[PDB]
Amino acid sequence: KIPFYIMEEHNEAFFIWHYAVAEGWINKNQNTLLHVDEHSDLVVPILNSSLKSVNENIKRVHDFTYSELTIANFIYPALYQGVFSQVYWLRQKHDPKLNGQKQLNIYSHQGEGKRLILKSKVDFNNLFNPDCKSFTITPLNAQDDLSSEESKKLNKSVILDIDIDYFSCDNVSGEYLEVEITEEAYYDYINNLYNKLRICWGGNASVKYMDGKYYFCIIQPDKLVAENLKVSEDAIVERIDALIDFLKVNEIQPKLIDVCRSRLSGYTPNDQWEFIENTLVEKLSSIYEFEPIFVSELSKKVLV
Amino acid sequence: AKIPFYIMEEHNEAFFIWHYAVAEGWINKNQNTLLHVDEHSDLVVPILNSSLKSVNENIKRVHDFTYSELTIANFIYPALYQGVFSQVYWLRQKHDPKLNGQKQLNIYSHQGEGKRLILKSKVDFNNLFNPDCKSFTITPLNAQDDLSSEESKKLNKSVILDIDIDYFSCDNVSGEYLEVEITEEAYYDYINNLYNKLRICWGGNASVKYMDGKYYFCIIQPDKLVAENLKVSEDAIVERIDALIDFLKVNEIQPKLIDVCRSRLSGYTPNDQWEFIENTLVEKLSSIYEFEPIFVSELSKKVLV
Ligand SMILES: [Mg+2]
Ligand SMILES: [Mn+2]
Ligand SMILES: [Mn+2]
Ligand SMILES: [Mn+2]
Ligand SMILES: [Mn+2]
């Protein structure tokens, strides 16, 4: 049986990886992240906690995961800790400019493990620096014919990290961020000349009134440049089958599989997420042996 | 002849002052130089709800737009798109070493509507004779720079002296700190729900706080202690004001309009220094220029009548 885990939001993947190392399902380091997602999740985080200290025990990892980790900044931390030595990002259609391997290195400011710094060329000072980790991020497609040399390089301690929004996505519902505010806060935003929030926070940011309630729209997606990434149930099935073929052809045997719904964040359509998860698990069960366990089960063992 | 001199609280108000200066005829409609003396570039490209073509119609319209869609960092490119300035010179204490020489840039609006601004490094073939497309330069400067006669000649044309007092002494941590009053429901969902969208999207870059029976959502800097401190001493401030006054004398700068921004309500200028910086700056500017400083409120007064 392959360890198989399902989470609501992607930051939880960090907790699952460290749990797997603790139980010994995957190795301490030199693992491969097969990151199957519409988004790269390669935001370089600044953290309050040192990633050196977070690693010590699983209870500390759990608290960090649901505190400082976002749904787009959870990979570079795992790379800085040396959990993965190479990342393969699988997408429906990649940007044309970005193609082939990318030789990168990550270190923290003054070795504190708080402010991560990304570089293409390894600095002379970071030569034989334990803080500095070298790795490669590669853009792949499910329809890519992979060479015998490239196939060998990918197939080393593989973690199959799948976000359901890979198959069908809604960036408009996903990007949109709001918080309910008081009438006093709403009024000051519009009418106060020097309301810091209006004149210091740009983009599409706004305040709105609905149902006798007030909201600060922190982030509104640009609907003019928004692509229609929501596809039919047939297109989803086709896309899931294409992933199975990529895994079959490259003879991928994961040491850990994790699935992210991304339906509470709204990136996966709310009327599809059940169909995509159910169909994926069915299709994954045809080539792999596993028992799907919800991430809550891991939390309960840690909290007690 | 006195130089029109206007003091404002926040930098978005500069846009209003520039268009007022055009309407009165203190400066020309176009081909002005923006001498931008500030710690921050204020070169955010804004996507707007109002067309910048329509905003320019009358001064009331400009005033409404300034206190609506503008931020303290996106007020320059709208003025460049409207053709108010043909070149910007950014005066900073210490620039990025990579940033050298004049940057040949052009700005145009999506479909010529004047709502969505698009910034480019080279003029697109379609925008070669397009009157919606404006060509300009943005150049870094230092107060210690000795300009050539060719350089000084190029720069010293219809100058607007645009000073943000955060150039002399700055606090980016105080300036970047934002908080908004939220409801009980919003506060307790953030606290109890692990999948609350504010939590999972922003993590340690945001937080919530309870103060005097009220709830706030706060945008915060993680590892705040390690963040840079640009707050300097009064002596350093005086030395830096003298350095500017010397640069203005040496290059024989005679501004058609001076505007000063406090940035103390936004908190970019330290609250214990802003009065000292402003008073010293105005005192040492009067040693090389003749003017009577007027607060931006007096301009707003006339428009709303
Ligand atoms: Mg706005
Ligand atoms: Mn993801
Ligand atoms: Mn995703
Ligand atoms: Mn400014
Ligand atoms: Mn400034």
Numbering used by the authors:
A (entry chain B): 3 to 306
B (entry chain A): 2 to 306
Verbatim from the authors:
Here, we report the first crystal structure of a peptide arginase at a resolution of 2.6 Å. The structure of OspR reveals a three-layered α-β-α sandwich arrangement, which is a fold shared by all arginases.30 Apart from this similarity, the macromolecular assembly of OspR shows major differences compared to other arginases. As confirmed by analytical size exclusion chromatography, OspR forms a homodimer in solution. The dimer contact region is almost exclusively established by an additional domain (residues Ser170-Ser234), which is absent in conventional arginases. The narrow region occurring in the center of the OspR homodimer forms a large surface-exposed cleft, which presumably acts as the binding site for the 10 kDa leader region of OspA. The base of the negatively charged cavity accommodates a binuclear manganese cluster typical for arginases. MnA of OspR is coordinated by His12 and Asp43, whereas MnB binds to His41 and Asp167. Asp39 and Asp165 complex both metal ions. Interestingly, the OspR structure features an acetate molecule that is bound at the substrate binding site serving as a mimic for the guanidine moiety of the actual substrate. Furthermore, the established arginase mechanism features a histidine residue that serves as an important proton shuttle. This histidine is replaced by Ile73 in OspR, a residue which is unable to perform the same task.
